[PDB]
Amino acid sequence: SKWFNLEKIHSIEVQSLPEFFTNRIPSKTPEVYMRYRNFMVNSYRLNPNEYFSVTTARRNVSGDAAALFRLHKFLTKWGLINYQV
């Protein structure tokens, strides 16, 4: 995924998970988004042979479960995680 970069946010992400890009919700910002996102991607990349689950994400990261589920769904859809299980 050449388009993806751990230090940036691509237009694909802004369009797909608008809840973090409203400029009107203090708790949901690009900074918060990158924290959650990078944790999932970094976790999967550590052990690509294993399926990184929503349950593991919620157990390891403190955050809104529904938002984490949506983030996980997005990363799955675009092949950023669980692409070599």
Q: Where are the domains of the chain?
A: 1-85
Structure tokens at 39: 């944790």
Token pair belonging to 59: 């157990």
- Tell me the backbone φ, ψ of residue 64, rounded to 5 degrees: -60, 120
Nearest to 4 by CA among 32, 31, 42: 42
Strand blocks (E) in 18-76: none
Instruction: Determine contact, residues 68/58, Cβ cutoff 8 Å.
Output: yes
Residue 3: partners with Cβ closer than 8 Å, 6 or more residues away: 10, 12
Elucidated via: X-ray
E strands, 16-75, in order: none
E strands, 1-85, are none
User: What CATH code would you report for 1-85?
Assistant: 1.10.10.10
Q: For residues 28 and 22, is the Cβ–Cβ distance under 8 A?
A: yes
Long-range CB pairs of 3-6, under 8 A, 24+ apart, other chains included: 4/80, 6/34, 6/38, 6/41, 6/42
